[PDB]
Each structure stands twice: as C-alpha cells, then as structure tokens.
C-alpha cells in the first residue's frame, strides 16, 4: 500500500486506509455509503464560499487541461497544471494556509490561446458570453497581484470585508456587516442561535441570502439532502436517525434554530458506531468570524484505539499516585475516542484535521455536552507516509537508533500523545489561593511542558508493558530519542532565518530537551557531536534521561501549583527561546535537501454500491486505486452540481 501519491509546489498528496470497514455489517456499510455521497456533493460549495470567481476559474482550467491538444511538456502547460493542482488542493485561487493568491507561472498569451482552442461549449460561459469575454473577466483576477490578493485579511486600517476575497459578503462594508450582526444579537438569550452562520450577507436593504433548499446553493444542498434521506432509511438506531432527520430539515428550511436542535440531538447520539459531520461548521474562513465554511466527514469508531485510551483513562489514579511530583500537588481522586475517517469533503478535504471537537455553540456545549475525537487513520497515514522519506536517515545519530525508531517510533509517539492528552493536563492540582494565571505569558508554555513531561516520564514505565500498551520495555527509547532530537535540533526547520523560538509548543519542547541536556552534561547523559560538519544528538543513558524528565516534571509541577512566575520565566527564557545561528543554518540546509513538502493533504478512497437485478444492495466495496488528478477530475465531473456563478 502506497501512502504517498504525488508532490508539487509546496504540497504533498497522501492517501489513507479505512481500517476495519469490511468488518461492518452490510446495513452499516450502506449507511456509510449514503453519508459519503452526501459528503462528496458539497465540494462546489466551499469553492464558491472561498471566492465568487473560483468555480469559473476551476472549470476554465479544467476544460483547458482535459482537452489540450498542444505540447504538454512545455513550461507554460506544466506551470498551468501545477496551478490547477494547487486550486484543487486549496478549493480556490488562494493558499490554503497563507491566504495569499497564487502567482501564475504561465503567460496570459498562453492561457488566451489555450482557452480559444477549447470548444466554447466546454467553458463555464454564461448565456451569451464569449470565450474572449470570459478571459476579460477572469484574467485580471488570476494575473494581477493587486486584485483579490488575500482570501482572508487580518490587517488594520483596512475594510476586511472588502479586503478579503472570500464570498461571504457582497457589496457590504465591514462596518455594515459587523453592525448587522451586532444588532441582531440578544444578550439575554440563554440559548442563542448562531447568527449569520449559514448565509451570504448582501445589499439588494442589507439582508441575508440563506444557503438552503430553494435558496443559495440549492443545487448542491438538494443533492446532500437526497443522500441524507437515503441514510435516514438505514440508521443504526433511533437516536442517530433523529440526528439525520433534523439535519435534513435544517438544510430544507435554513433555520438556525433547526441547527441548534440538530446539534443537541447529535451530542446525545454518543453510542452509535457510525458518525458524521455535514454542515457549515467552522468560521475561520470569514475575517469577521461569523459565516462558516462547509465541510463534511464520515466516520466510524476505532474500537481498538479507543480501548487503548480507555485503558490509560481507567488507570488515571495509578499514574497520579506514583508520579514524581511532590505529594502536596497530587490529586487524591482523579478521573478521548478515536474515529476512523471513511471520507473527507469540503473544508476537511484534501487538507484535513487530526481531531474534531464539536459543536461550536457554547450554550449547547455547556448544557448538553460535546464530542471530541481524534482521527486515528489520518494520524497513522501521516506516520506511514513519512517512513523512508530520508529524514531519519539524515538526522538520527546511528543505525541502531534509526532501527529502533523505525520499529517503535510511531507507537510510542502516539502513546506519548495519549498520555499528554488523556492524563498530563488533568494531573496535579494548584495549592489553595494560587491564581491559575499566575505564570502570565509563560503559562501556556509551562503547562504544555508539564503534560509532555508527564507523558515522557510514563511512556518509559514498565507498567505500560504490563498494561499491554507497549510490546516491550525498550520501545520508549524511540520516543525519547526523537523528542530530544526534535527539541534540541530538528524542529529548527520551522524557524525562519534569524529568528528565535516563539510558539508555545516549540518552546516547551526546547525547554525540556535543553534542560535535560544541561543537567545531564557532567555525566554526558546526552551529547551533541559533529561528523563531517553535521550535528547529531547522542543519548548515552536512557534510564538517567527518564530520571531527569521526572525531576523537571516535579520542578514544573511546583512552579504551576505555587504560582512561581519567576521560576517559570527563568526556565522559559534560559532554555526555551534562544536559537544557535550555526545549528539553525546547518539543520535547514540538511533539511531542504530532502525536498519534503511542508503541507499535506489526502485523497479519499472510492466506494462502490453493488446491487441485484431489482437494485437491492448486496455489497459495498472500498477501493484505493485512484490518484490525485483522477479524483479531482472525477469530483468535478460527477459531484459538481453548482452553477459556475452563484448570484
Ligand atoms: Cl469583485
Ligand atoms: Cl456540529
Ligand atoms: Cl528515513
Ligand atoms: Zn496539550
């Protein structure tokens, strides 16, 4: 199985497996199938939300790309192909992370000739429009760097609504937009709807054009609703069926009270094996933070992985009791499901998340609860795709370590994460009267260090062999080596030339690693050595490293529990911030030679329904033999119901 698909620009395309899909019942597979169809119909929605020209530009390049009869080896065509592939990755003409608009690496004359040589019937022309007019429309949008430069703008002294190419507002200023929603809000509403979540705000009166059946985007929403109605007929139980039924109504009415009702039912549906997301969910695509991008995920519970986190959870008190922290900081009584993604769509595709924490409505989270999950097969795909990429070959000090990391690194890294997330933050307590914010700007860095150290100290414990979480007592050394190598050295690849460590998690890792390095130095517990001008991290006593991790854990627990700001500051400023310029440049030059793309995204598997003569389903199969170009072209042909212009 090949986890890697292709690489272009600053992007690498991967694939993921859907483990245990074949173990589901046939009816369960049917429900997954329908939900995945409901997911795939939404792709055009996100494109349009990210820019009113995106569907035209996508469809123009797509018509050129698939019918081109010219020299496909020529640089103009190759750069146009890269551009289109970036548009597919980013669901628009702007960088999926940076928001800046892509720079075409091909000439306008080339595109003009390519467009004119395409059957005009195949171009996304409006009625009565010519190919020349479509180019006059789109070429400034594509080629002029000053036009629609950012998909989301965060700058001051600018009208962020007009300065942002996203398509949630049309002909409305930022002050008009914020005022509309500032006025609509009711402070006294204890169960407030998510004002403005599902509409374009336009001036036509400032009014809302709601995304719903019979409204804006109805061509795609109608298809989503069709497949959801199919899914409704094969629900696993009545709770999940009610979720599906309410979600259909929300799409049919556009009512935001239906959305809250749906979200309440969704949080109550905690038992079902299969779950999904399908809606306008997160609001980061909007510079005002009001409108939500469309996304979808279909999934089923990863039983084995969830069981492992439940083993960790149910032993919370054992880890607390045996902790190396001072007894006065220990909780006397102290008390994370994993899901398998079946398909990704909308703002989860192809660039996706490793965890989902929903719903967003605070009053629903407070009174009814929430679902917070991690996506095990996406995390695993990340890990598997990295094997053999050249990184450990370049930076690991010797072949024994490389062999131990290849064998155990993935397992013990994820286990360390599980310890950090399931127990590390929950462990320990403040002393009476101590302000939780006593560490001020250092609080986040110290708190993440504390949880990481809890995980590091315990990933090495023999208890974990007994508990059947690690297969033998040496496995932890893989995680120990990579944590110290990343903390002292290889995370510098994320720092720009001439800068220091800024982000809290990067700081907490350098903090831990540099402290252990300093404290172990008289016994050469950890060394940094050069061969042929390259630096390597050398670990000489793994047992002493565990003891040092424990000593720093105790010290950091004391800092937090007593509110020791000066202690926090001392640790952060002395260990966590300063970058050695020579090491930084050395690591970057070694890293850039590996040609590793900084961003990843995933293609989906392909599901097929098998029916009999009458059409009764007899099986549902999953396949992985589709690449990036194939899947994008197939989605644009078969899962692309929106008009090119949505006005
Ligand atoms: Cl415009
Ligand atoms: Cl939700
Ligand atoms: Cl490697
Ligand atoms: Zn954390």
Author numbering: 24 to 227, 230 to 360, 364 to 675
What is written in the article reporting this PDB entry?
Out of more than 100 drops prepared using these four conditions, just a few crystals of the wild-type protein grew in the E2 condition of the JCSG+ screen (Molecular Dimensions, Newmarket, UK), while other drops did not yield any crystals. Both proteins crystallized in space group P3121, with one molecule in the asymmetric unit. Therefore, only the wild-type structure was considered in further discussion. The coordination of the zinc ion is square pyramidal with two water molecules in the remaining positions. It is interesting that in the case of BtDPP III, the corresponding Glu449 does not point toward either of the two zinc-coordinated water molecules. The superimposed protein backbones of ligand-free bacterial and ligand-free human DPP III structures gave rise to an RMSD value of 4.41 Å.
DPP III (EC 3.4.14.4; earlier names: dipeptidyl arylamidase III, dipeptidyl aminopeptidase III) is a cytosolic zinc-metallopeptidase of the M49 family. This exopeptidase catalyses the hydrolysis of the penultimate peptide bond of its oligopeptide substrates with unsubstituted N-termini, thereby sequentially removing N-terminal dipeptides.
